Design an enzyme around this catalytic site. Structure first.
Site, PDB file in Angstrom:
ATOM      1  N   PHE G  63      68.379  53.493  33.303  1.00 42.80           N
ATOM      2  CA  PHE G  63      67.076  52.966  34.072  1.00 42.80           C
ATOM      3  C   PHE G  63      66.793  51.718  33.234  1.00 42.80           C
ATOM      4  O   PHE G  63      65.520  51.553  32.705  1.00 42.80           O
ATOM      5  CB  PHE G  63      66.113  54.004  34.302  1.00 42.80           C
ATOM      6  CG  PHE G  63      66.585  54.909  35.152  1.00 42.80           C
ATOM      7  CD1 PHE G  63      67.150  54.634  36.315  1.00 42.80           C
ATOM      8  CD2 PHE G  63      66.409  56.343  35.177  1.00 42.80           C
ATOM      9  CE1 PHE G  63      67.552  55.616  37.417  1.00 42.80           C
ATOM     10  CE2 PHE G  63      66.698  57.405  36.010  1.00 42.80           C
ATOM     11  CZ  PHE G  63      67.138  56.785  36.989  1.00 42.80           C
TER      12      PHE G  63
ATOM     13  N   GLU I 173      65.557  58.102  30.364  1.00 37.62           N
ATOM     14  CA  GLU I 173      66.709  57.022  30.497  1.00 37.62           C
ATOM     15  C   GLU I 173      66.410  55.729  30.185  1.00 37.62           C
ATOM     16  O   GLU I 173      66.465  54.852  31.124  1.00 37.62           O
ATOM     17  CB  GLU I 173      67.440  57.209  31.866  1.00 37.62           C
ATOM     18  CG  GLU I 173      67.997  58.591  32.144  1.00 37.62           C
ATOM     19  CD  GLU I 173      68.831  59.238  30.991  1.00 37.62           C
ATOM     20  OE1 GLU I 173      70.001  58.476  30.486  1.00 37.62           O
ATOM     21  OE2 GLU I 173      68.373  59.940  30.399  1.00 37.62           O
ATOM     22  N   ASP I 174      65.669  55.566  29.028  1.00 37.97           N
ATOM     23  CA  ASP I 174      65.329  54.130  28.732  1.00 37.97           C
ATOM     24  C   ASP I 174      64.341  53.498  29.799  1.00 37.97           C
ATOM     25  O   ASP I 174      64.535  52.511  30.197  1.00 37.97           O
ATOM     26  CB  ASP I 174      66.447  53.305  28.404  1.00 37.97           C
ATOM     27  CG  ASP I 174      67.116  53.663  27.220  1.00 37.97           C
ATOM     28  OD1 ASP I 174      67.559  54.946  27.074  1.00 37.97           O
ATOM     29  OD2 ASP I 174      67.736  52.836  26.431  1.00 37.97           O
ATOM     30  N   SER I 175      63.202  54.261  30.180  1.00 41.46           N
ATOM     31  CA  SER I 175      62.303  53.876  31.144  1.00 41.46           C
ATOM     32  C   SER I 175      60.892  54.031  30.588  1.00 41.46           C
ATOM     33  O   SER I 175      60.723  54.669  29.275  1.00 41.46           O
ATOM     34  CB  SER I 175      62.299  54.556  32.466  1.00 41.46           C
ATOM     35  OG  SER I 175      62.037  53.579  33.653  1.00 41.46           O
ATOM     36  N   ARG I 345      69.802  55.034  19.113  1.00 41.67           N
ATOM     37  CA  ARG I 345      69.750  53.460  18.972  1.00 41.67           C
ATOM     38  C   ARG I 345      69.244  53.124  17.790  1.00 41.67           C
ATOM     39  O   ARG I 345      68.985  51.875  17.226  1.00 41.67           O
ATOM     40  CB  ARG I 345      68.845  52.786  20.302  1.00 41.67           C
ATOM     41  CG  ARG I 345      69.580  52.909  21.440  1.00 41.67           C
ATOM     42  CD  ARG I 345      68.540  52.630  22.687  1.00 41.67           C
ATOM     43  NE  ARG I 345      69.150  52.758  23.922  1.00 41.67           N
ATOM     44  CZ  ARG I 345      69.634  53.899  24.517  1.00 41.67           C
ATOM     45  NH1 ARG I 345      69.305  54.968  23.851  1.00 41.67           N
ATOM     46  NH2 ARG I 345      69.968  54.086  25.533  1.00 41.67           N
TER      47      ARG I 345
END
Ligand SMILES: [Mg+2]
Ligand SMILES: [Zn+2]
Ligand SMILES: [Zn+2]
Ligand SMILES: [Zn+2]
Lengths: 46, 192, 115, 48, 49, 56, 144, 67, 421, 261
Positions: G63, I173-175, I345
């Site tokens: 996302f 999820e990288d939000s 990351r």
RNA sequence: GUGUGUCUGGGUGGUGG
């Protein structure tokens, strides 16, 4: 009908008619800007 | 649904405190690093003065590089073991890792203890200049700092030479991805 | 483009109901209260006041979707004590407690200005 | 030429016969939504 | 005395860098290349022709 | 250029007038010496000359 | 004119996509069988498609600006075959490795590890709150 | 480009505090002390009045398109 | 074509640069002692890459000290600062040495997409695409390199209080989850400027005019009365897709349809307010107009956001102020990011930036995040923060927004620079 | 079974913020009271502007958005005002609106600040907060020579649930159980946590002994108003609004009960 | 007492997953 433009430099109002050369009435600039419309401008202050 | 609504109560974070360790652990990390650099210096002295005997099935450079790689791999393993052993049950890195949600023990070691050895094409940093990696190094310097071994962690901060070497490793990863995509795409098309 | 209007979190559309009473069929004396145009503000106080009730053996509130504006309150009670009047009891006790708290706050600020 | 029309990936066979652009399709970015079921998908009002 | 101590080194080097960027700027390579081309290379092409 | 702000991107070309020796393997030469040679102040097209030795 | 709008049996009306409609949801590159799957439509306000976090794994979807291609099957035959073949539950287990392609991920995984620990003890009201996010609950509160 | 009326985080009014902040800085007060004197105790409002760029002044240098 | 960079000169294990040069350079605006004088003084010189092969380069002057074996005792040159190896975009990154190198590469790519005031005369320019943020802020955590990148006077983002927590699963999820109330207060509001251009010509002949259905052929069923009598929308007019922005008609060689309508319309998916219309003459003398359309873009679900460390993320849900978690002081986060985005990351620069931003905001100061500064580390920042009444690791006892029950785990919350792509 | 007996103890009553203690009440009640502070206290803010002249560099939406965020003295007018949607007038009537006008022309060669003094109200009770009689005014826009700004704006009743400009508070410091007796938050290293200001503990102790029978009982507030309403009025209006919300829900519930049986 | 024409074909560059 009396369309008014604004000189980029002089900021003067010019009655330019249709299919006319785009020339200022004072400095003869080639670039002209239109005046803000008159209809209605309303924004909800968000 | 149920687990998220309980996570409203429990909550789960990650921060600076999870990437730090007490004075004892950092002392152990520094001692392990110092001993590793001493071993690399001793191996370098043995190679230069020719006390070091080549192992069969390879040349003298290969033997020296293999021994240096063994020493630095042992250093990384020991530092990672020390860092992981130092974690608490409230550490959020440990929580993310043991749950298997994301991350790895290698990531914990790199963040806390030691980033490790940076590699280019499977070997250490090449002598891009004439017999040295960077102009800040003496010619024919086979030590850890000269050939890409990042002593510091991501918490302490990479020194600029280590920053450049880490950039070289990352660039290698990016290039590999970029070419791999097209090659596998054509293979997959033929296969289907 | 598809942004919903800001008022829609609290304004009822043209026609639907504020609250609905639905009987749960798998457990007796169990109901699902569907309050429209509401959020955790009413849900938590109603649930907490119901939890205070000894004649209540289940009470919980749920917001099915944050982009939607309804809450589902599920109440299960003793066989004599219907959950609807249990809900009414919770709202009445909450109103009484809030009014008492308001009057005490009023006399508190009155005393503070007076000394 | 005709050979150029037929041979390419963007040509006629691979570009228009095997795979082609279709109607009744939508595209927009995706965002998480833990409240939906796995088989459910959120759809914007304009797209629907 | 005629030396920079370690505690004073940071402000000194950043003064040096500030002076450099005040003088040269950030796009000096493009401007200098174009200036050299206009001043000299055009005349050199004309004379060499 | 016609109201569009154009930018010239620097081109990274191999340096001229300098002899470089490369290990051009997978060919019938073993070693090669390339000298992309151009004369100063006219920039006539580069006349590269290769000197190479046979492989045996 | 309303005389035109008078429907009769046998006509076909192109209604908009309502809830419960079956769509095929595809993300490029379409690598394996789970790269395009059947999904049920739920209408939502804002301008993005929404996904359950479990299906991010079969799609290899993140996302961080990922786009996705929706396809609306037009005929009832195509809709039925997508419903019987390509729906997300029907293809949880992949044939490439005979293991489930989708699983519990990230927040849910860390929190379920933190949740199933032996030291986690829930008060009554917390149990009430969690119990009603169960769609399969029988309604009987367990003995503590 | 102009100081926001309200702090993004909490909502305290900081549209009236830019000029007082500049005056305090001109009075050789430390910007921490200046922020303290303006009553911005929460670091959200301190960020609000501290990280702002007064770009409206640069825009005022250009001529108006019509007089 | 040769590439070279300045370097200090070392002779007899001493810097040729002395205190006198710095004292003169401090008065640079007064006595016009420039960098050119420093070059002419023999203190600095440009070293090519080929020359760099044979130099002995010192990282820093304290590396010249002979208190030990000293590694090398024939240093010939010294770096002015190691941070100068970074480019323009990489100079924006705070603490780049605390990040994985791919993250720095991603931020270098994404720093060219961040919104902000791209130029001071943006209202004059008529670029086809332009994004301007309402309230850009200079970063609280600032590297000294971008003192000369003009970043503190043309910034490209907002310092925002982010809490790295898993709140409701909408940041997975990288939000990100962002404060709806903050967004209403102008947080990351931006404006998108679209410019159209059109030229009339005579060969047939075409002109700008307001066409009519009685003399023009095949127009669309859109409001042509938005235009003025000369065929141009006036500024201050709301305009949607498929609306004529410029009324243009071309005559036909050979009734009801003596002309053909060749009007330009607004893009179908785009809306906005016309804000600047210009009429002029092109190179060859024909009429030529440009119309700038203004569209205010509120940050919504799906809009991409990014930190200064490659932590890109699309906006998930937006919660109002009451729904968002809050500290004991009532400080809600502006954004909430998932903790799962960090460990894989390695963006420890993100965490150190948050810590330093908290210290700077409480101190009333601008934190220094020059990459290779030994004077600054995590422990000094932690001690500084502990002096201000906060937990030394930037953690706080957050409260649940929905219930007011203080969360079991103490959330890491602080200000960090964020960018809207 | 029945309601609690919530007592109140107020510690600070400054004109900008109120600090008070509520005892003998539930955590949910206190948190809902905080939520009603933030989002369900109607005030009056500008929500409708008509710009008929804007030569400023800030575009029209910028100026309108800035105008909406300016706080207005909402004291005692909000009680009698009506929601604009709930009012029968086809326009903004005085019984549901407050008219604001602004007309600033910069005829001077020096910069003009369009402060909050230029927001001229049609009523004296409601005005911009800074205008009340020391402290500087809110800057709407800066004007150089030749630029004007003419606008007529209306302020309507509204609450924070619709837009943040209707939020009457700025920072609601809600805290309970400072000494961590309930252990609702767990410190891995409790010694390095700064004590809260309401802590009843001494310097030696890190956290209080855990009390299983204990429940959240004392709640600590600090409601800092932005000046639109008095903070005491904010608290009282919040309590009344929450009470009326419950009353409306009870009335609707009784109607559904009648419709069902 | 109504209503469809929506500048194609190449090339170059940048970008997102
Ligand atoms: Mg990808
Ligand atoms: Zn003129
Ligand atoms: Zn604030
Ligand atoms: Zn009215």
């Amino acid at each position: 009908q009396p369309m008014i433009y604004i000189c980029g430099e002089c900021h003067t109002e010019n009655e330019i008619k249709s299919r006319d050369p785009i020339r200022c009435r004072e400095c003869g600039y080639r670039i002209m800007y239109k005046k803000r419309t008159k209809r209605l401008v309303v924004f909800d202050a968000r | 649904t149920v687990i998220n609504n309980w996570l409203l109560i429990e909550g789960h974070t990650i921060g600076i405190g999870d990437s730090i360790a007490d004075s004892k652990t950092y002392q152990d990390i520094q001692n392990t690093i110092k001993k590793a650099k001493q071993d690399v210096i001793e191996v370098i002295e043995k190679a230069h003065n020719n006390e070091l005997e080549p192992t069969p099935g390879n040349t003298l450079r290969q033997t020296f590089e293999n021994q240096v790689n063994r020493i630095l791999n042992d250093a990384r393993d020991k530092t990672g073991s020390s860092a992981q052993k130092s974690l608490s049950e409230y550490n959020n890195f440990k929580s993310m890792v043991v749950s298997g949600a994301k991350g790895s023990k290698i990531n914990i070691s790199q963040v806390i203890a030691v980033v490790g050895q940076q590699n280019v094409e499977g070997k250490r940093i090449p002598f891009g200049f004439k017999h040295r990696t960077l102009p800040h190094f003496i010619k024919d310097d086979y030590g850890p700092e000269s050939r890409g071994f990042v002593e510091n962690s991501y918490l302490a901060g990479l020194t600029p030479t280590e920053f450049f070497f880490h950039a070289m490793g990352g660039r290698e990863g990016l290039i590999d991805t970029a070419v791999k995509t097209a090659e596998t795409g054509y293979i997959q098309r033929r296969l289907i | 483009m598809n942004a919903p209007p800001a008022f829609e979190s609290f304004l009822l559309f043209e026609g639907e109901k504020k609250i609905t009473i639905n009987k749960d069929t798998k457990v007796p004396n169990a109901c699902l209260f569907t309050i429209n145009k509401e959020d955790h503000t009413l849900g938590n106080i109603i649930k907490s006041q119901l939890l205070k009730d000894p004649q209540v053996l289940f009470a919980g509130y749920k917001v099915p979707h944050p982009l939607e504006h309804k809450i589902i309150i599920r109440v299960q009670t003793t066989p004599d004590y219907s959950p609807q009047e249990a809900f009414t009891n919770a709202i009445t006790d909450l109103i009484s407690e809030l009014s008492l708290l308001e009057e005490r706050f009023r006399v508190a600020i009155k005393d503070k200005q007076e000394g | 030429s005709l050979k150029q029309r037929l041979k390419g990936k963007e040509g006629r066979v691979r570009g228009n016969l095997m795979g082609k652009r279709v109607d009744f399709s939508a595209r927009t970015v995706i965002t998480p939504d833990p409240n939906l079921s796995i088989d459910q998908v959120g759809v914007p009002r304009s797209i629907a | 005395d005629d030396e920079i101590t370690p505690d004073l080194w940071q402000e000194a080097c950043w003064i040096v860098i500030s002076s450099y960027f005040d003088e040269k700027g950030l796009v000096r390579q493009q401007l200098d290349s174009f200036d050299e081309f206009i001043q000299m290379s055009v005349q050199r092409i004309v004379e060499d022709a | 250029i016609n109201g569009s702000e154009k930018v010239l991107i620097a081109q990274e070309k191999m340096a001229t007038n300098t002899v470089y020796v490369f290990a051009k393997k997978d060919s019938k030469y073993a070693y090669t010496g390339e000298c992309r040679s151009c004369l100063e102040n006219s920039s006539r097209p580069t006349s590269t000359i290769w000197v190479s030795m046979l492989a045996r | 004119k309303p005389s035109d709008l008078h429907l009769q049996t046998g006509y076909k009306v192109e209604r908009h996509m309502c809830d419960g409609d079956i769509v095929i949801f595809n993300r490029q590159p379409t690598l394996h069988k789970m790269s395009m799957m059947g999904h049920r439509v739920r209408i939502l306000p804002w301008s993005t498609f929404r996904l359950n976090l479990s299906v991010t794994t079969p799609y290899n979807a993140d996302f961080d600006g990922d786009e996705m291609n929706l396809h609306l099957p037009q005929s009832l035959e195509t809709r039925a075959e997508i419903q019987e073949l390509a729906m997300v539950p029907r293809m949880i287990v992949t044939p490439q490795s005979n293991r489930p392609v989708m699983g519990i991920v990230q927040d849910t995984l860390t929190a379920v590890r933190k949740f199933t620990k032996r030291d986690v003890f829930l008060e009554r009201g917390e149990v009430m709150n969690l119990l009603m996010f169960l769609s399969t609950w029988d309604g009987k509160v367990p003995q503590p | 480009m102009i100081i926001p009326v309200r702090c993004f985080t909490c909502g305290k009014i900081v549209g009236n505090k830019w000029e007082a902040y500049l005056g305090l800085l001109q009075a050789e007060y430390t910007e921490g002390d200046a922020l303290d004197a303006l009553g911005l105790k929460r670091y959200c409002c301190r960020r609000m009045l501290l990280a702002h760029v007064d770009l409206i002044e640069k825009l005022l240098n250009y001529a108006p398109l019509e007089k | 074509g040769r590439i070279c960079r300045p370097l200090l000169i070392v002779e007899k294990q001493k810097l040729l640069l002395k205190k006198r040069h710095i004292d003169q350079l401090k008065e640079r605006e007064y006595n016009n002692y420039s960098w050119q004088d420093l070059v002419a003084s023999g203190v600095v010189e440009y070293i090519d890459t080929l020359e760099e092969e044979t130099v002995m380069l010192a990282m820093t002057p304290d590396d010249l000290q002979e208190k030990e074996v000293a590694y090398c005792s024939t240093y010939t040159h010294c770096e002015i600062h190691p941070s100068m190896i970074l480019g323009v975009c990489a100079s924006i990154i705070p603490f780049p040495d605390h990040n994985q190198s791919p993250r720095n590469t991603y931020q270098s790519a994404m720093g060219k997409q961040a919104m902000g005031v791209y130029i001071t005369n943006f209202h004059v320019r008529m670029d086809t695409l332009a994004h301007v943020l309402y309230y850009p802020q200079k970063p609280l955590v600032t590297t000294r390199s971008m003192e000369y990148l003009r970043f503190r006077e043309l910034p490209a983002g907002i310092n925002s209080i982010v809490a790295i927590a898993s709140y409701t699963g909408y940041n997975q999820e990288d939000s990100v989850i962002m404060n709806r109330s903050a967004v209403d207060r102008g947080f990351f509001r931006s404006v998108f400027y679209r410019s159209y251009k059109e030229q009339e010509s005579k060969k047939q002949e075409e002109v700008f005019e307001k066409p009519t259905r009685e003399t023009c052929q095949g127009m669309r069923h859109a409001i042509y009365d938005k235009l003025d009598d000369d065929g141009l929308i006036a500024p201050g007019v709301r305009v949607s897709g498929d609306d004529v922005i410029i009324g243009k008609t071309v005559t036909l060689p050979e009734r009801r349809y003596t002309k053909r309508d060749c009007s330009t319309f607004l893009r179908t998916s785009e809306t906005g307010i016309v804000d600047q219309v210009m009429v002029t003459l092109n190179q060859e003398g024909y009429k030529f107009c440009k119309i700038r359309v203004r569209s205010v873009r509120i940050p919504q679900i799906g809009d991409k956001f990014a930190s200064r460390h490659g932590q890109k993320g699309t906006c998930g849900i937006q919660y109002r102020q009451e729904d968002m978690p809050f500290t004991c002081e009532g400080i809600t986060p502006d954004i909430i990011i998932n903790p799962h985005a960090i460990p894989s990351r390695m963006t420890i620069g993100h965490l150190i930036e948050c810590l330093q931003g908290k210290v700077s905001a409480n101190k009333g100061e601008i934190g220094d995040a020059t990459p290779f500064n030994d004077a600054v580390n995590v422990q000094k920042i932690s001690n500084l923060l502990s002096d201000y009444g906060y937990h030394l690791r930037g953690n706080e006892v957050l409260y649940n927004g929905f219930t007011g029950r203080k969360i079991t785990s103490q959330i890491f919350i602080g200000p960090t620079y964020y960018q809207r792509l | 079974p029945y309601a609690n007996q919530p007592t109140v103890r107020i510690t600070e009553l400054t004109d900008e913020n109120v600090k008070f203690i509520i005892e003998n009440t539930d955590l949910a009640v206190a948190n809902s009271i905080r939520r009603v502070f933030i989002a369900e206290v109607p005030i009056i803010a500008i929500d409708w502007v008509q710009i008929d002249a804007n030569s400023s560099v800030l575009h029209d939406e910028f100026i309108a958005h800035r105008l909406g965020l300016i706080p207005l003295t909402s004291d005692d007018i909000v009680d009698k005002l009506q929601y604009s949607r709930d009012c029968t007038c086809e326009e903004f009537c005085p019984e549901c609106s407050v008219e604001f006008t602004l007309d600033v022309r910069c005829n001077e060669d020096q910069t003009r600040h369009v402060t909050s003094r230029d927001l001229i109200s049609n009523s004296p009770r409601v005005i911009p907060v800074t205008s009340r009689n020391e402290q500087d005014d809110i800057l709407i826009v800066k004007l150089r020579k030749g630029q004007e700004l003419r606008l007529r704006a209306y302020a309507k009743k509204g609450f924070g649930k619709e837009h943040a400009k209707w939020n009457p508070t700025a920072g609601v410091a809600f805290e309970y159980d400072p000494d961590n007796a309930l252990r609702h938050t767990v410190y891995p290293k409790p010694e390095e946590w700064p004590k809260s200001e309401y802590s009843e503990l001494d310097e030696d102790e890190s956290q209080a002994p855990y009390d299983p029978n204990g429940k959240p009982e004392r709640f600590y507030y600090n409601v800092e108003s932005c000046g639109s309403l008095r903070p005491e009025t904010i608290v009282l209006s919040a309590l009344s609004g929450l009470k009326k919300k419950l009353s409306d829900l009870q009335t609707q519930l009784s109607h559904e009960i009648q419709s069902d049986v």
